[PDB]
Design an enzyme around this catalytic site. Structure first.
Site, PDB file in Angstrom:
ATOM      1  CD  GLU A   1     -46.530  11.047  18.163  1.00 35.64           C
ATOM      2  OE1 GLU A   1     -46.977  10.833  19.308  1.00 35.64           O
ATOM      3  OE2 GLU A   1     -46.046  10.153  17.440  1.00 35.64           O
ATOM      4  CG  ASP A   2     -45.607  11.096  22.635  1.00 31.02           C
ATOM      5  OD1 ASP A   2     -45.238  10.694  21.518  1.00 31.02           O
ATOM      6  OD2 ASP A   2     -46.594  10.599  23.213  1.00 31.02           O
ATOM      7  CB  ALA A   3     -39.945  12.093  19.687  1.00 32.67           C
TER       8      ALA A   3
END
Ligand SMILES: [Zn+2]
Ligand SMILES: [Zn+2]
Lengths: 61, 1114, 48, 67, 45
Positions: B733-735
């Site tokens: 998730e949104d790395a």
């Protein structure tokens, strides 16, 4: 004494008073405070006028 | 270019900001204070007088700030950047002229200096006013700097724009269980701070005030004003043919119980129940003290003899409170925007000035009458020889109030704090976004979500999508893009103007006609009782648009009650919109062409009658149109430009109208934390902790907003080539995922600059501080701590430092406070060392060091350290559409994928954010970006418009790519095609703050607190984290009982106490000291935080007697 | 209850008061001066 | 500041072409899209290195301490 | 040596110690230390 404290706290105002007029920075005014501190103890302050004994004091510093 | 008024109404919005800027509020308020109001203060404290020597006087005739009258030059003044490197106050002198009686003759003197006024930048009194980047090149200031902030003693501060509730109006309230109350606060400039209440106890109306000790029913106090006929009173409050008369029916009999029935008795009933003024006048009348009690009340209006208008003003106040009990819907909230008076800085520093200016001269009159009681010193004595002794009480009073933002007044006795703030220089717009922000009053409505929420009366008044989160969640708000603040002009001549328009007078009308007709309200007060208002109001617009009356007047006209409102109070919100008369506007595109010729500015649009200002109250009566394709023959006031509803710190979002609204505040809180350039003089200023980006780039998809603040002239962040996809599982998730090569080519190498300072200090025994350095050893100067310390003791410019390695050597005399012995006997060896060691985990460089003097003769040493770093993993990135993101790993270039041309993408993000975050804007910006590069043209992304999609897909399909950017590319790790298609393009990734090299810390076993023997809170104080109470519940839910003691007393607070068995309490090393036997003593270990409790609770008379058993032999 | 020496109701008003140790009220040396900012307990106990 | 010497992604050098991009706009008043494509910037990862590059080093050098 | 240089007077001078804080040729009172001649070392990545 507290009266000894009350007369220096009064005099704390007056040597700071002329320092504002002559553009004196604070390290002269605090340095001359000890000269007034000893001259009070050495019985020099009695008899003379109040404004005369502080104006002669801070010139030495 | 065939110009039209259809899509080129935008081209006057720069014509507004050009002549009339964006720091309108702080410039125009303070500049009015300098010219006008400074004369208005000395005219309120002129003619100092003494009782002794009554023929002596001194008078203040005028006031000038800046130049003298003899030389008539501009001035000779310190430069501001030269002032900010010496920790001085950027000030300007105060000059007056004075006339007084020296003696036998009176004498007038010019140019008396009293003090120094710290004045904001870009004001007309500073030297930066109207420069040409050549004087400003010589004065090394940035041309792009907004200005509007003070430089008191070094650090640069700015006063925020405050607001409060609408003073000098009435507000109604609705409370469930304690009855309902109406409030009306009033404060004129002479000692007045008074608010009035209308309470409804158990069905009976009362009036309480903070000067009256009791509550008084209203049927007395209007009979005390002369209106006593008591059928007027039913007809004023209620009118006729309603339910109000039965609601008022209880109130009338309280007049009957005390049996007053007359105007004479109605006064002294109040004054018999007042406890005020303590008999300041020794000659009381006891009937005259209610005429003044009728004067200190409801201070909107005053009286001379009739008490006419103050009587009905109570009744008009009382008509509201009866209608409140008839139905609770009529009560209005105190968070409507029209009930808010936005109060600025220059009209707020004036409130402190007149309070402090009268504190000057009343101390000065005590410095002359001490002399005037002398027989010999009574002729030759002069006054202004001792004007300089009180001169340093207006400088250090102003410079304290601005440095420490808490203003202690006397006439109001109110102690608001934090009115000033240090402006944040993280980004360019971060220093501009703090110039336009609002700090509220925090009225202790923490239970009510009313002020926390957002009201719909805010469209274009002030910004909507920039509001912080967390603790400060809704009490901070921000101005719009087109916004002017009103100012009061006068209420006297408009009262003469309405009488020309055929309105009646207040002292003539019956009680019957006023409820039947309407009524003009002047600042909440009726004066005229007008009939048929539509002929009255529309002629007055025609009087205003022609420009006989000043334009900042609003004709708010409701219909629930029977009244119209006139407002001239000033300091309220407004924005301008263009006038539309009928089904055709007043556009006149030939005027819009005559603007671009250059002789038709924005001020002439309101002079000729083509634009006018509207407050929030006039937007009641308006019927604003959106577009010229939306004009109706019942439609007024076409709206000038629909995307001017976003703030300057909110405007940098590209295409926001596709994007979700909660993902706008997440960016506007982060946009102030973006790193980029600062200013043109950024290699010259010495600020505390200041970052830079090495290689900045302007963004690909710009905005019409960002070219008005010149964000593009010095941007923040750079645009890289994104390939949105999942890869290697390291972005869940949104790395983010990026390549080692692009960092090695220099992808955003930020750089940290940091100030450190020290002051050489002079003592009372005339001793300075010396810079002796480089003590030597074994034929060489440099010790391991001294390779970068230089010959003079100042660290040498251009070489690095590590842990240890003193960079400024400071030596202090050991007789720091000893008394001055007036001799020189033994002064040769007294300098003990007290250096400053460079800490930190990473090697930094010395950029440069300067030394100078302060305002007193006292030396300064200020070196600015320097280091840069590479964006390794951990560093928080952003996306400019509100996506926080942390670098997951760093791949090499071989593992990265590649298109048919071999273009390797820079940053990877997973596609798993776009359904949840609903961020459509990045999905269309990447199309808008890619087609612009191949066409070589920058594309505009605006709100409520901008470049479309279908014309943009035509461009890159001619270049040969996919028609919506959805490309396909091979895999770098195995070679072949990918089963799905990719989405590709350049997107603008700006770096944030909160890098990880200065957040990693660890405390193994370090310093302990002096009172608790506990680890010290704060990373700069070596840390040691708080295992709080909530984690202590989660341990015992596992049922583990052995690390619970180990993590709470063994590794933290172990302390060993000897306690006595009988008379159980502790004693020292081997004693009991209450039965001195030294025998029955048991050694144990307890928490020290429990030991001092057995002293602190033992300090008062409670004795914790301990009782002991052994563990074994159950 | 009785049978303790401290069981009298005489000892429930102040006639003697003890002074606590200085460890619980330590002289915080802020290093803003050559003098110490002396804490609140001692500057209340002084005029007692 | 000054132009980056290589591209960010591919990494062919662009340091000889910033002055040529300026020289192709004073003389020969031309579109910017067809200008650098004539110069040889086929890859659009290379094209964004010069479009977006604000050159602040001209504005910095007017604050020299050497007069 | 190449001691303290002024801000905008930009005049190389060697101040003798504990004597003044101003520069010559101008009354301006902010002055910079010049860069040393000593060699320093860096990397290229
Ligand atoms: Zn014991
Ligand atoms: Zn010089």
């Amino acid at each position: 004494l507290e009266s000894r404290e009350a007369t220096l706290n009064n005099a704390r105002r007056k040597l700071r008073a002329v320092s504002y007029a002559l553009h004196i920075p604070e390290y002269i005014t605090d340095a001359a405070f000890q000269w007034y501190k000893l001259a009070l103890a050495n019985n020099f302050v009695q008899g003379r006028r109040s404004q005369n004994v502080i104006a002669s004091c801070l010139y030495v510093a | 270019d065939e110009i039209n008024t259809a899509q080129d109404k935008w081209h006057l919005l720069p014509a507004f900001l050009k002549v009339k800027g964006l720091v309108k509020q702080h410039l125009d308020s303070f500049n009015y204070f300098v010219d006008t109001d400074l004369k208005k203060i000395i005219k309120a404290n002129q003619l100092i007088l003494s009782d002794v020597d009554p023929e002596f006087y001194l008078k203040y005739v005028d006031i000038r700030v800046g130049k003298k009258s003899s030389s008539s030059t501009k001035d000779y003044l310190t430069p501001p950047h030269e002032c900010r490197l010496r920790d001085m106050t950027y000030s300007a002198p105060i000059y007056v002229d004075i006339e007084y009686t020296r003696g036998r003759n009176i004498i007038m003197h010019k140019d008396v200096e009293i003090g120094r006024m710290p004045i904001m930048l870009r004001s007309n009194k500073c030297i930066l006013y109207d420069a040409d980047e050549s004087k400003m090149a010589k004065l090394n200031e940035c041309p792009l700097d907004p200005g509007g902030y003070f430089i008191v003693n070094g650090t640069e501060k700015v006063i925020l724009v405050q607001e409060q509730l609408s003073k000098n109006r009435i507000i109604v309230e609705a409370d469930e269980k304690k009855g309902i109350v109406q409030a009306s606060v009033t404060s004129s400039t002479h000692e007045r701070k008074s608010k009035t209440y209308v309470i409804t106890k158990n069905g009976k109306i009362y009036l309480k005030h903070n000067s009256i000790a009791e509550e008084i029913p209203i049927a007395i106090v209007l009979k005390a004003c002369g209106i006593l006929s008591d059928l007027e009173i039913m007809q004023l409050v209620c009118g006729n043919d309603s339910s109000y008369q039965d609601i008022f029916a209880v109130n009338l009999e309280e007049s009957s119980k005390l049996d007053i029935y007359t105007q004479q008795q109605a006064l002294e009933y109040i004054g018999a129940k007042v406890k005020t003024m303590r008999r300041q006048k020794l000659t009381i009348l006891q009937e005259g003290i209610e005429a003044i009690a009728t004067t200190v009340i409801a201070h909107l209006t005053v009286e001379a003899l009739d008490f006419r208008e103050k009587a009905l003003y109570i009744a008009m106040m009382t008509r509201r409170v009866v209608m409140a009990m008839y139905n609770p819907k009529m009560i209005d909230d105190r968070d409507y925007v029209g009930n808010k008076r936005l109060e600025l800085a220059g009209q707020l520093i004036s409130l402190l000035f007149e309070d402090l200016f009268k504190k000057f001269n009343n101390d000065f009159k005590l410095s002359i009458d001490k002399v005037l009681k002398k027989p010999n010193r009574a002729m030759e004595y002069d006054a202004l020889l001792s004007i300089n002794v009180h001169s340093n009480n207006i400088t250090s009073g102003l410079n304290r109030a601005i440095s420490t933002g808490n203003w202690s007044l006397k006439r109001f006795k109110m102690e608001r704090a934090g009115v000033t703030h240090v402006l944040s220089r993280l980004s360019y717009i971060s220093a501009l976004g703090m110039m336009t922000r609002i700090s509220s009053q925090f009225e202790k409505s923490r239970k009510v979500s009313g002020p926390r929420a957002l009201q719909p009366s805010q469209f274009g008044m002030l910004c909507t999508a920039d509001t912080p989160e967390g603790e400060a969640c809704g009490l901070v708000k921000n101005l719009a893009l087109m916004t002017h603040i009103t100012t009061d002009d006068e209420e006297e001549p408009i009262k003469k103007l309405c009488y020309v328009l055929g309105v009646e007078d207040i002292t003539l009308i019956d009680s019957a006609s006023l409820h039947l007709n309407y009524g003009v309200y002047l600042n909440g007060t009726l004066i005229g009782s007008i009939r048929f208002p539509t002929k009255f109001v529309t002629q007055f617009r025609h009087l205003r648009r022609t420009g006989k009356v000043s334009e900042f007047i609003s004709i708010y006209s409701n219909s629930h009650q029977m009244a119209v409102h006139i407002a001239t109070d000033g300091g309220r919100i407004c924005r301008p919109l263009i006038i539309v008369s009928d089904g055709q506007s007043r556009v006149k595109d030939i005027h819009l062409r005559k603007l671009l010729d250059g002789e038709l500015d924005f001020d002439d649009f309101l002079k000729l009658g083509l634009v006018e200002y509207l407050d929030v109250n006039e937007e009641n009566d308006s019927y604003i149109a959106l577009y010229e394709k939306d004009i109706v023959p019942s439609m007024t006031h076409l709206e000038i430009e629909p995307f001017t509803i976003l703030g300057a710190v909110a405007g940098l979002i590209p295409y926001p109208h596709h994007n979700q609204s909660p993902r706008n505040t997440y960016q506007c809180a982060m946009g102030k934390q973006a790193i980029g350039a600062i200013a043109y003089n950024q290699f010259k200023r010495i600020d505390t902790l200041l970052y830079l980006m090495t290689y900045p780039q302007q963004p690909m998809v710009k905005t019409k907003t960002i070219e008005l603040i010149d964000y593009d002239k010095l941007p923040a962040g750079q645009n890289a080539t994104v390939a949105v996809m999942s890869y290697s599982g390291y972005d869940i998730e949104d790395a983010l995922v990026l390549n080692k090569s692009s960092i090695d080519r220099g992808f955003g190498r930020c750089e940290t600059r940091r100030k450190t300072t020290t002051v050489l200090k002079r003592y009372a025994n005339h001793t300075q501080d010396i810079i002796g350095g480089m003590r030597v050893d074994e034929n060489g100067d440099p010790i391991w701590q001294h390779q970068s310390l230089g010959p003079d003791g100042l660290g040498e410019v251009g070489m690095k430092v590590q842990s240890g390695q003193i960079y400024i050597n400071k030596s202090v005399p050991t007789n720091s406070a000893d008394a001055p012995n007036p001799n020189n006997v033994n002064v040769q060896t007294q300098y003990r060392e007290a250096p400053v060691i460079y800490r930190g985990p990473e090697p930094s460089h010395i950029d440069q060091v300067m030394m100078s003097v302060s305002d007193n003769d006292q030396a300064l040493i200020k070196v600015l350290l320097r280091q840069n770093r590479r964006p390794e993993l951990g560093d928080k990135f952003s996306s400019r559409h509100g996506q926080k993101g942390v670098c997951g790993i760093i791949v090499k270039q071989e593992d990265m994928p590649f298109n048919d041309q071999g273009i390797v993408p820079d940053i990877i993000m997973n596609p798993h954010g776009f359904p949840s975050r609903m961020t459509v804007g990045k999905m269309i910006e990447l199309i808008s970006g890619k087609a612009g590069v191949l066409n070589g043209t920058l594309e505009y992304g605006t709100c409520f418009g901008g470049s479309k999609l279908e014309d943009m897909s035509k461009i890159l399909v001619d270049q040969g790519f996919n028609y919506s950017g959805k490309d396909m590319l091979y895999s770098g790790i195995t070679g072949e095609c990918l089963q799905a298609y990719i989405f590709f393009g350049p997107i603008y990734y700006q770096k944030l703050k909160h890098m990880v090299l200065d957040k990693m810390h660890a405390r193994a076993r370090g310093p302990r607190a002096v009172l608790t023997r506990q680890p010290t809170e704060g990373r700069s104080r070596d840390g040691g984290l708080r295992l709080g109470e909530m984690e202590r519940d989660c341990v015992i839910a596992y049922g583990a009982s052995q690390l619970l003691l180990e993590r709470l007393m063994i590794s933290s607070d172990a302390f060993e106490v000897d306690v006595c068995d009988k008379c159980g309490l502790m004693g020292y090393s081997g004693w009991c000291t209450t039965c001195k036997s030294a025998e029955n003593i048991i050694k144990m270990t307890i928490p020290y935080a429990a030991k001092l409790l057995f002293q602190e609770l033992l300090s008062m008379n409670i004795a914790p007697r301990l009782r002991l058993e052994d563990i074994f032999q159950q | 209850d009785a049978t303790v020496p401290s069981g009298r109701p005489e000892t429930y008003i102040w006639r003697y008061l003890p002074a606590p140790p200085v460890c619980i009220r330590p002289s915080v040396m802020m290093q803003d001066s050559p003098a110490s900012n002396e804490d609140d307990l001692t500057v209340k106990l002084t005029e007692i | 500041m000054i132009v980056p010497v290589r591209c960010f992604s591919c990494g062919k050098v662009v340091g000889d072409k910033w002055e040529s991009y300026l020289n192709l706009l004073q003389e020969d008043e031309l579109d910017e899209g067809t200008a650098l494509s004539r110069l040889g910037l086929k890859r659009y990862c290379c094209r964004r290195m010069i479009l977006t590059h604000v050159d602040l080093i001209e504005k910095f050098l007017r604050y020299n301490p050497l007069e | 040596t190449l001691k303290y240089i002024c801000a905008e007077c930009s005049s190389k001078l060697s101040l003798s110690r504990t004597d003044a804080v101003r520069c010559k040729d101008c009354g301006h009172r902010i002055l910079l230390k010049a860069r040393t001649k000593r060699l320093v070392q860096f990397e290229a990545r």
